[PDB]
Structure formats: structure tokens, C-alpha cells
From a paper:
Aleutian mink disease virus (AMDV), a pathogen in minks, and human parvovirus 4 (PARV4), infecting humans, are parvoviruses belonging to the genera Amdoparvovirus and Tetraparvovirus, respectively. Despite low amino acid sequence identities (10–30%) both viruses share the icosahedral nature of parvovirus capsids, with 60 viral proteins (VPs) assembling the capsid via two-, three-, and five-fold symmetry VP-related interactions, but display major structural variabilities in the surface loops when the capsid structures are superposed onto other parvoviruses. The viral capsids are critical components of the viral infectious life cycle: they protect the viral genome, are the determinants of the tissue type and host that is targeted (tropism), and remain intact while the virus escapes the endo-/lysosomal pathway and trafficks to the nucleus where the genome is released, leading to viral genome replication. The VP monomers of PARV4 and AMDV conserve the β-barrel core motif (βB–βI) with the additional βA strand and the α-helix A (αA) observed in other parvoviruses.
Three-dimensional-image reconstruction of a total of 93,393 individual AMDV capsids resulted in a resolution of 2.37 Å, based on an FSC threshold of 0.143. The reconstructed capsid of AMDV, the first determined structure of the genus Amdoparvovirus, also displayed familiar surface features with channels at the icosahedral five-fold axes, protrusions near the three-fold axes, and depressions at the two-fold axes and surrounding the five-fold axes. Unlike PARV4, the three-fold protrusions were separated and radiated further outwards (the maximum capsid diameter of AMDV being ~300 Å compared to ~270 Å for PARV4). The amino acids, including their side chains in the VP monomers, were generally very well-ordered to the C-terminal tyrosine 647, with the exception of the apexes of the loops at the three-fold protrusion, involving aa 93–94 and 238–239, which showed only weak density at a sigma (σ) threshold of ~1, preventing reliable placement of the amino acid side chains. However, due to the cleavage of the AMDV VPs at D420, no density was observed for aa 420 to 449, but both ends of VR-VII, leucine 419 and proline 450, were visible at the capsid surface. The region at the three-fold symmetry axis between the protrusions is primarily formed by VR-VIII, while VR-V is not surface-exposed.
Author numbering:
A (entry chain G), B (entry chain A), C (entry chain F): 42 to 419, 450 to 647
The structure:
Amino acid sequence: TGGFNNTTEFKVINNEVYITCHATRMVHINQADTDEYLIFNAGRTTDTKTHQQKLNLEFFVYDDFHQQVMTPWYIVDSNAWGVWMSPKDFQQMKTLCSEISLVTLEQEIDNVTIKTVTETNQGNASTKQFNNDLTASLQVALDTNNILPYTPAAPLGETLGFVPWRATKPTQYRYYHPCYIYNRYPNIQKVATETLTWDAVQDDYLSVDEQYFNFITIENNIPINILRTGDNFHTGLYEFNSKPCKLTLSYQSTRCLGLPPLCKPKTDTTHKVTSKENGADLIYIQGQDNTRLGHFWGEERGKKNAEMNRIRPYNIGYQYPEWIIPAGLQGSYFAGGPRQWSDTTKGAGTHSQHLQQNFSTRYIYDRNHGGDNEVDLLPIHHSKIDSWEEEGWPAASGTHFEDEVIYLDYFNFSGEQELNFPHEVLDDAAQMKKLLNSYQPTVAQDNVGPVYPWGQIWDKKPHMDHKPSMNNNAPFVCKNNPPGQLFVKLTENLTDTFNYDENPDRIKTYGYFTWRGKLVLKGKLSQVTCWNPVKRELIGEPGVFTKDKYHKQIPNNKGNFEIGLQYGRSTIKYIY
Amino acid sequence: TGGFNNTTEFKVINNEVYITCHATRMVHINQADTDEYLIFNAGRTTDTKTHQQKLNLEFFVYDDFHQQVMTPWYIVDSNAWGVWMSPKDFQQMKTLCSEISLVTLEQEIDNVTIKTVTETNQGNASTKQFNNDLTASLQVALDTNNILPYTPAAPLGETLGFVPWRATKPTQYRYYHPCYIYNRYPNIQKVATETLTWDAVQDDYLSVDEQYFNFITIENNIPINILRTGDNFHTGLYEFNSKPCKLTLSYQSTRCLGLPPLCKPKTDTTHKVTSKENGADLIYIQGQDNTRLGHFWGEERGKKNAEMNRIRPYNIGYQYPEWIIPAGLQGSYFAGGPRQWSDTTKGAGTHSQHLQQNFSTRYIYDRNHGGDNEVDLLPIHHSKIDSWEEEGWPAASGTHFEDEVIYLDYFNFSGEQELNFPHEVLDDAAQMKKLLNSYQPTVAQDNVGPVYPWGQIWDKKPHMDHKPSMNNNAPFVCKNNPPGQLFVKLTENLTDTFNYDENPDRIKTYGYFTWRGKLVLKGKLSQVTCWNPVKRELIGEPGVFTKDKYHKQIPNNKGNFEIGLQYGRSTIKYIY
Amino acid sequence: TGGFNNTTEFKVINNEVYITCHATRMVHINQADTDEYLIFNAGRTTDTKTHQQKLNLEFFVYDDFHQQVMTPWYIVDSNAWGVWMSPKDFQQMKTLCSEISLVTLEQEIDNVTIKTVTETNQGNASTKQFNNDLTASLQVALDTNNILPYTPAAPLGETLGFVPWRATKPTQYRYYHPCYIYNRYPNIQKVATETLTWDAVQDDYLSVDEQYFNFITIENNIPINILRTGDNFHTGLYEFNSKPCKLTLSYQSTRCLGLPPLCKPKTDTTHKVTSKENGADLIYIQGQDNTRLGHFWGEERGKKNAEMNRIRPYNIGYQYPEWIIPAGLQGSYFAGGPRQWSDTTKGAGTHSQHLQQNFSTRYIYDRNHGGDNEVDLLPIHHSKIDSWEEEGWPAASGTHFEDEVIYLDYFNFSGEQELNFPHEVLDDAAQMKKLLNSYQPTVAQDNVGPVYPWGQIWDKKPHMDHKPSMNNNAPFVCKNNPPGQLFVKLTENLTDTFNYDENPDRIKTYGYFTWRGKLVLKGKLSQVTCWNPVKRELIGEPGVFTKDKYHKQIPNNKGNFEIGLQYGRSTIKYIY
């Protein structure tokens, strides 16, 4: 119990499943470059001026500019799926459960081991001796009240590593210092056409306001614990309050809600639905084509209605303009959009990449977060980072094809004479692609579920009058405050000569400690009602045909392997 | 207790603060011009026709047209912040509390004093004698069930006065009679270009439908109390059910949510954040520029991502087109928009007024509601009314610069070759300024908080299927029905000769009474976590430099002074 | 609890506020140059003789001469405001409380970590190895009876540092050995005019008397505790007995005590008090100018009295000659004077610096006591020390303009004929500036309150027949003996070769330990009675206009920042 445990156990009692995840890591820690708190601006870029050419797009989307408070502390951040479960474990949960819910979280720290480094230069140096420092200390701070600004580490891909038998690193704690107004290319609309004079304007604009300085330290707000060799620290028992998350996906749109029309099967010939042929024809009124007994949108033009204007209870998904970037106080940002899953739209760039598949997402990760240490084929030697394309497949229900929207003004007509397109329908659809937000209160939207390994498990809600109902990063949002962030630091180890200036003179020191945590999940046995057997794995891009993906799922002779993406919502189910 | 009490007491018990506000006013009342209920149309305006010039904008935005039920009664309306607190008191609450909540409300009426006026003409008249009428009565009606349509008096700037030692007036009770359809400039789109014939169309359009007559009187619905000299009336104890309102503002946008990038401070040179220089530079992967390990929007173009497409949990604020007026049944109206706070956008009208600062607001008020009796420098002599510009400073978090929005269609590219703007980006942004609604379920919006003195404290929610989540006028919205409206009237005092026609022959009569009320507030001690001292006052426009504002905060030799604006949300805090 | 805690909590119970201040520091300690007690004279200076020029003033005011007992021990001195509170915390207390009082003090020492230094010379030396010495000891002595002479360390600006996350140093313990008589320029009045012969006299005079030797050691008087690694030391619970200190300042003088004259406001014209015009005129008796019904000083000259000779209950402040230095046994010293706050006296050096603002004070401090590490703009490179000018603003009530005093001999006259100045009034005022002490039993004087960060919190009263009622350094004076001084020392760590001579042969040794303390304050909720909102910040010299002060309140990219001055008494209130 006082030692390494990384295991999962599945237990079913009341027809509820209980998932207990044990995780343990060896955490290697170094001392920060200073013991000071630091506050600085970083990322302001001056483009290379072309007033005779044109303004630079690359300069526009690559701003990293921000202002930052950098602290001597480090976060131990366990919030990602890859920390708590192996690939088998996540498949197990994915198969057993129809839905899951967070129950409770525990974590502790012990096995503090600190050493000092001595370097004597003999034979042109390159000699290091390592000695235990038995009185050296590790400082631990738990913020249970969430005083400090909340910084989940999964979106930057730096958390505890995903492999239980490798050592891992904490990340240094830092947070934004939103005291400023920043904008890049101000007055974009004051350049006349193209290069009439200069097409580079002012570059950026910046103003900092001392009014807004908010500078928060750990030492003032939180009590700090000091741990030597035999010491240990326990966070306590945290309880999640949050709603359950379904593990099923639906492939269903507005056209599929409710009763289908009544049809008469074709008796003469035989068809399968994959043959893409009519196997039946509709039964209309008195044999009169297009005449149905419904509830429909519009006015009667002669009483011809179809499956298209049949009134539906709800709208599934909504049309939203793709890649709009608004400008906030502190910079311009991608607004994103409703997650959708598209594939195989014939046109545009033809068959190569098709479209972005609506609002597409990439994960980019290193060796310890599930990358094979080699970049996948199609100055450093090659590259050590891997990436994955997360296309939103569980969200397929509400996907919309942005090119295909049609606008009609008068749909009905006072007579049955004819129905023709206006000659502006083509142009009017192009405008409607980029400018149309179809969201309304009849819309039902479905987010992507848990994403493995790299997805964030839980997140904090913002403190605001109008609260958002959805979250891009995480399937679980805490109603109350989230689990407290866990900060760790090496005690300053000083030489005999005290420095009165900024940076202290220190003995070179490092250590490692054991992080151990327990995460408890509650779920419900999956009940699948279909006759046919179910396929729970997204296919079309495995290593089965010449993609060599699944070959890389186990270690090689060097010990390198990579972890594949898995969606928590893998099972088909009817909504409505 | 049976007498004048206007005081506030702050009391802290459980680490909760209790704020008890006592308010008392002398209320001068007159008898209405008739004892009848009146129903009329008012405000229809015929413009001066230019068919040879152009249609008049001034005629368009200045419609006051409405239909109205005017009643003999008067409202005693205490719902504004300036009624219950002094400028010191509101600063006190603003400093002590992190949030506040409404607890309970009591109010009563006594000290009824009624007089009659006799005028004898001697020496060309101008002589008035005043006599007590000891049997005269004041009628009081409390609508506890909210039968009558709800008409908060703060938006028209007429409530009980804000100064405790001045006498004040009630306002006469009236309400809209929505039986009609009204529109001004119908068929605006049927004029061809400019003045091809006549550019003034039909002016307005009006239709009244007897179907919709709803005419409600106090006498049928509510029991009425009669008060003579020694009598007194008590409303009882009302209990608010509503959510708390935070007293903190955030200056934070989407770019500032979560972990900042890891950076390395510059060791050679020294900078302060106000110097607007880089104090550090980012650490990229393998020194390869723009390469980060993230979670990002889009497809990999060669794996260059930045702080701009970094996926964020939420969107803070949203882009909404500014100054759109839709046309409802009973007229066209300004839709408003999400409250924002802008300043210092270089461009457009240059430095003078900059923009509207997004959705700007004005208060316009008289001497008793906190105006100095003189209009501020830059047919009546001068003007006695003052105004204040409420620019939405507590809402700064979600402000957007409408000119700066960018639209990209294909952000990703199948190769790393180049990224260039399309030549339509400039035009396509102009369209997107006026037509784009970026609202979606990931948006978090923050309203302006309590506004002092002129802001409304509480308000009623509409009885509707889809209820609104935000309110422009008031920080507190009652889940159940709001406090009952308090109606007051002088009993008809008739001469000896009874009139059988419309308006009664009355003895000229007036009186005054004492209104007294108690408002209880609950709050939580403010906990500020920053190192630096906090600045709780909005500056940049005080009387400190040559604005002579704070000089006017205390009475002059005439007793005139004016009350300055104060935001309830004055303290900076991190959301998320 | 056995670890780092630096936090403050504000708690309100009985309508009393309780302020608990937690403070913790890492204290770096070195071994003193000797283990001996040392007694020496220091500071005697021989001026460069000009008998042909004139005696040197610089030589006069720069004497540091003293006799001193220097001890091997070190003081841990927490007595300053900057130790116990952050800038936010002090503002909080300043805003919440009308007055404060000291309750109790606790402090302890643990986390003793001692190391030895070994230096091997290889590659021209410059190599240090650091080893734990696990049996080495720290000696701790608490003087609970105040046997040793009391030496508060704030006036020399050396106490524990003000920043909680920086390491800090103790100061070595030393005290005056008052056995001697010292005087500089004896017989200053025996030089005839200027340089009649030699204008440098005898320089100084000195005599030491063995009669008065008082030489006190820690080892004889106090029991000493020995602490190794796991050990800890607790002082116990100390209880303050002292009177409360108000947190309000008054701006009020003798002219403002009591009833003003009755006046009649001007009805024709309008004025504000900042316009500096009469808004009313006085009502005299029977319209007879200057005739009032009073209680006045003097004899009736014809019964014309004014607001100037109106008898007042008290005198607020008193006139005292500024910069007189008396000569005591052990040297000449500045006597100081009643604290006053002056500004804007037109004359003398005109507008540049005006006067000293009466008895002015400077603080001079280093980086760890709140200095930015750079000296403020307007052989070492530049200078690392900062200074602040403390001008006595809370004491403004009793300030006097020393140039403006008038002396009359016969004020009254046996007739109404005329009142004229004597021709000597001008000269007689000049004499009265330098020689006049106006103190008397009707005087009410008000000291400066708490001063942040650098002010001393508490102090000891002298053991004397006539005790002083005021203290220049500290707002709190203990009636009983003050908290005991806490002495700390490294145990002598000796080599194998024992030295029989004066200074011992030691292993080079240093350590650090944790100092932790808890200070409890009691206060009363501030009750402000004014209508207008209150301004609690001294302005006219912030960084708001081009002074860049508040910009420096948060760390830069190097971690340097400075702490601004704050007066405990920031709120205006009427005395009397």
C-alpha cells in the first residue's frame, strides 16, 4: 500500500459497474532557474515588411504573444485518460459500459529522494559524483479552494507520462496575466485593395494597464508541507459532482426522426440496402404523386409535400461558419464550432483530402505521451514527435455539409403551376456558407466523448453570469470547484555565501518522488438491443492494410511503441 | 420605529455579511386630472414629406408611438440602488463583499397629512389658504399576486428620490395596451434607389384589433385600504428567491484561458511588462519554429500551430452585429447586444470618440435622482438635466473588436508550401461585421453588475415557454413573482354639486405621507488573493485632472450636488 | 503545521475583527568571525584641520562614534510591519478597521540544516564541496526576562526580509556600552568670530570611566537550547498588554474646534468651496462689524472680537524649534519634534522643495526590505539602495508654520482708537521661530500611526521616574516588559588541533533554519459616517502621472519589485 500500485479492477454489483484505477509514477524533479516569481511578455513578433507585396498571413495566424506569470513551482497533473488506464483497460470500459460517471479521487506523494551533484574537473572534467542529501526537503502545496488560476496541462500535451514503467517529469507552473489589450494587424480594413501604398499597416497594437494587475503567489495563499525521506503526503478524499457521460454514439439526423413513410416492398426483384437501389416504393394518396397526410412546413401549393418539409421535433446539429476568428481583448482566436464528422464529399479538392471534415482537431505529442519516438513517414535528424487527427466521429449525427445549403424565399405558391429556382440561388448559397449561424432553441447538439489517451478527463466551469453548456476539451465539468491543483517544489539549497542580489547561489540539487493516485468510476452495463453483432472499432485507418499501425502497438527491440487513438463512444445507438 | 429612519448597518456573523438598509421618504402627492381610467393612442407623427429629397432618418428613430391605459393611481417605486444606499454605503458594500444576495423586503406607509386649498381673489388674487382636512383619506392598494402589468420605474428615471432629506414625488401609474400592430416606413424596400419618384412611402401603418382588448383596473382586482391621519399600512414580509450576484469583474479573454506556453526568460536584459517588450522567448520543439505539442484546431500542414488555434474550453463573449433594429408587432426596437467594454481602438474616427465602445448606454436624470441642477458644460435657460455614459466596464472580458474579424475557408493545406490571404479577405470581413452572430453553446457571457445610483435592483421574468437567461436592466431576477407593486391614491373629495358628466367637480386637495422600507442583503466577505494592493475605483475620468467631478460630490451654498456612477463589480478576479 | 505557513485570515465575530498573521522564513546563518565577546570603540574621526578657513559642519553631523559590545550571537527580529503582512493584507486591515490592538505572539524554530565546506585546490582551486554534518547543532536562547539591553532592528533596516519566498539573514547581536563621555567640538563658543586664529578647536573630547562597566553575556544569564536536525523550539504564548491605536487621521486644527459663527448664505450667486470665494457672510450684532457674543481672550477694546481670539478647549499641536541638537553624555543628537505634515508654503526656496515639511523622515532600505534592486533615477556601478520620504501626513492636524508666528504684547487697548503693529514684530517673529517652545498642558498631540512596510510594530518603555508619553519609532509600547529577544548561534565546530590563543581554529560551517511565527491582532469594524465616498490612498505622488511607481509594484522578468509606503491611518475622521 505504501508502494507502487498501477492496476485497474472492474467490479459489478447492483447492475452498476465500479472501475477503480490505480496509477503510480516516478517523478523526476529539477530545481527551477530562479526562486523568484517572474512576470514578462513573450511572443511579440515583427514581420518582415512588404508594403510593395502584400500583408502576411503566416504572420497573422502564428502569434504566440501573451503575458505570463512564471512561478518556481511545478504542477503534478494527472488529468488525462492515458494516465489512468492502459489501452486494454480503456477498451474494457468502452465495451462494458453504456455510460460512466466520476466518483472520487485520491492522490498522495512519498518516497522523496534528493541528491546533490558535485563536479570535479580532472582529465578535462566530465565527472559527476552523486550524494544523498538526507536533510533536503520537498515542498508540497495543495490548493483545495482553487485560489490560483486553473491550468489543465493536457491541452499542451504535458502531464504525467502514459507508460507506467517509465519515469516522468512535472511541468513548471505558470499562468496568464490578463492585464493588457493586444491586437495584430489593427485596422485591417484601412488598406485600399492591394498594395496601393503599403500593405503591412501597424503590425500589432499593445497596451498594458496597471489597473488590472492581479499577482498571486502560492506562499501567501496556501499552507505548505515539507517532506523529507520518510515523509508522505495525502490529499484526502475528493468527491466529484457531475453528470454522467454516455459511451454510445448515434449516426442519426433530422431526416431520420420519427415514423418513415409507409411503403410497399417490391415483390418481383431482390435487393440489399448496400446495392443502393429502391427495394420498395411509397404509397401515396389515391395514387396521386407526392400527396401525403402530414404535418408540414409552408402553405398548400396543391398539397404536394415530401420527407423534406415534414415537420420534425428537433434539429440535430446546426450550420455554423467554419474558421472564423474573432478578436478578443488579448488576441484573436479560433472560435471553433460544433463538432461534426464528415467524410467522402465528392468535389472541391476532389478525392485527396476532401474537406477539413468540418471542425477537425489534431493532437501532437512526444514519446512519453504515446508517441513512437519516430515521426511517421509521410537542423535535427528527422523528428521525434507524432500527431493524430481527431475528426469527431462520435458526433456524426449533427454534421452538416456547408456547401449544400439552399435558401428559398417563397416556398409555397398560390397555384400548382410550377416550381423553379430563382437565378440567385447559387450565389445566395455561397454567401450563406460563410455567414450563416443556424443555431436555435430547437437544436440538439452532441459533443465528442472521452478521447484516449490524450483527452482531458475533467475541467472547471467559468465563473460567469451566462454559463456555457458545452466544453471542447473535457467530457466532465464540475458543478462545484474541481479537484485542487497539486504543486511541488524543491526547497532552496544554498551555499555558504549568501547572495543579496536577484538569483540565489545554490548547490546543484535534484530528486525524484513517487506520485500515486486512485480514481474511481461508476458506470452502467451496456445493453445493446440489435440482432447483428456490433463493431466497436473505428476502421478505415488501422494498420490492417499496409498502414503498419497495429504493428507499432507493442514495444520493439529498443522498447519504443506508440498508443493508438480510441473513442469512448464507440457503440451505435438511436437517439430519439 | 413609527418615524423617520434612514440608516444602513453592516454586520458580520458566520463569515457572512448582513446588510440592512433603512430608507424613508416624505412623499408629496397630488390628485390626478381625472378619476377616470383613460385609454388613448399617443405619439403618431407625420413627417414632413420630401419625395424629391430622401426619406428621413430622424423621423425613423424618434417614434414614441404607443397605446396606453392611464390610471388615476400612483406607484411608489423603490426599486433602484440610489434609493436604499448612500454613496459611502455602496462603496462599503462594494469593498466588503465578494457577492451579494437579496434576502427580504418590508415597507409601510403612515403620517398621512391631507390639506385643501382655498383661493380668494383680493388685490388681483394670488392668495392661497391651506387648511387641514382631518377626515380626508388616502387609498392604498398592494398587488401581492402581480395581477397588474409590471412597470419598473427606474428605466424612466422616475422613482423615489435619491436624497433622504428632500421631499419626493410618486409617478402616475400607466401601462401599455398591446392590442395593435404598428410599423413605421412599411415597404422600405419598395423605394427604387434614391428619389426615383417619392422617397417617403406611406409613413406609418396602424391597425387596432378589438380581439385583444385587455383592460384591467385596480378596483376590481385588489382590496383597497383607507388611511386617515393616525392610520398606518404594512405590506408584510416579502422574501426574495434569487441567485447571488458576484461583485467582482474579470479582465480575461479566450486567449488567457489555461496554461501559457513554456518560456525562457531573457537573462541579459531587464524589462517591465509596461515597457511592451519581450522579456522571454518561447521554447519550441527541437528548436523548430512554431512546433508545439498541443491540442489544436485544423489539419496538420507541417505541424506549425500557435497560441491562436490552441483549443480552449470555452468562448468568452461573442460577436454580435451592432445596432440592428428588428420590427415587432408594436414597433421597431433596438435589440441591443452582449455588454462589452471597449476603449482605445486606433482608427475610424481616430482618437476623438473612437467607437461606441460596443453597446454603450446612457442614463439621463434630474436633480432629485442625482443630477446637479445644472447641465455639464460641453426657449429655456441652459438645461437642468444631467447624463452619464455607462460603457460596460465590468463586462470587459467578452468584448470583441468588430472590425478585426477574419474568415478563412481552408486553413490547413496539404503541404507546408505557403500560407497567403485570399484577395477577398478584406471584403469578406466587412460583410462579417454587420451580419455575423457568433453565439453558440460554448459561449460564456458576463453581464454588467449592479449600477449605482440609477440601476434597477430586481425585475420580473416573462411568462414564456423559452425563458431568457439574461436581463439588461437588473442584476436580480425573481424566480417566483416579484415584490408586489404599491399603489396610492387620494380619495375623491367632492363639492356640493354633483357632476353627471365625465370629470368630477372636486375640492382642490393635496397631501403628503411617509414611505418607509427595509431591505436586507446577504453577502460574503471578499477574499482577494493578490500580492499587490487593489484599486477598486474606475479611473481615467474622475475630477482629479481638470474634470471637476469630485468637487461636485458635496453640496454647494445652494445645496446642489450630484452623485457619481459606481459599479458594483469593481474588483478584479480570475474567471477560470 | 510543522511546515511553511505564511497566510493571513480576517475573521469578524462580535463586531470585532480578528487578524491572524502567519509568517515563515528560511534563515541563512553563518558563523561569526570569533567566538569571543568583543568590546571596542568605533567611529572617532579626526577632521582635516582648517584653522585659516573655518570649522567643518560635515565633520560635525557625521559622527558615528560609539562604544560597543559585539557578541557571537545573532538576533531573529520580526518586529516590523513588512514581516507579517503583504501589501494587500495591510490595505485590507487599513480599510476594515477603525483601530487595532496587539493580542498575542508565538514563534518557533525548526528544520535545522547544517553543512560543512571543503575546498580542494585543483585547476587553481575554485572548487567547493558541501557535506551534511548531522551531529552539528544550533544554539537557541530566548530572553524572557529582558535581561539584555533591548535593540529593535527595524530602525537600522535589518530584520527578517519582507518577501516570503526569498531567503533572509539574521543580524549579529550587539549593544552600546555606555561607560563614557563623548563630545565633538568642545567649547564651540571659544572661537572668536571667524578664523581669528584657528577655527578647529580640539576636535572631540573623550573620557572612559571603569566605574560604569556593565558587561553582560548570554551564557551567564539565559539557559540555552541545543537543536539538531529533527529538533524544534517553541517560545510559548506571549500576551501583549497595550492600548489600541486608531487607524484614522484627522485634518483639523484649533480654528476648527466647536461651533462656527452663524452665517447667512448668499442667495444671488452660486459658489463651490473649491472656488475659494465667500458663499455666505457673517451675522454680527446689530449689524455692527466684528461684534459677536463670545468667550474671548483679552480685554474689551470696544468689543471687537473674531474667530482668532475665540477661546478654544484645547491647542492642537504646538510650535517647537526645528533642528536643535542638544549634547548628551555620549554625543550630540537630533531631538526631533512633534510630527507634522506641511505642504505648499509659498516662499523661502519658492516652489522647488518648499520647507522640510517640518520634521521630515527618511527610510533607507535594501532589496530584501522592499527596495527594487536599482536606485531611482533622480566606485560601484549606480547604487542598489532605495529610500522613501515619510512626511507625517497622518499628523496634519497639529502642523504649524514656523515662519508665521506673531507676538503681541498689549493686545487690548483702553480705547477703540487704532490697532497697529509695533515696528519690532518682524524681528521678534524671527527670534520666536528658533527659540519658542509653545508646549503646555492644554496641548493635544497626535503621532504618526503604523507605517508600512518599514515601521516598527512594538517597543519597550524606558525604566525611568518620568516616563515619556510618546514614541517616535513605534505605535505600540508595552506597559510590562516586551516580547523576549530571540538569539541564535551555530555551535563551535572545532578542528583536531586545539588553539590556546584568542581565535579558535574551526571547520568552515554554515546552515539554515526555518523561523515561523504567529501574530494576532484585534480590531473594530470601521464606521465611516460621511455621505461622499472615501479616498483611503495618499495621492499626489503615485506612478499614475509619469512617476512609474505603481508599475514597479509587481516583479519584472528578473523577479525584482519594490514595495510602496502605506500609512495605517488613511481615513479622515473628526477629532472633537
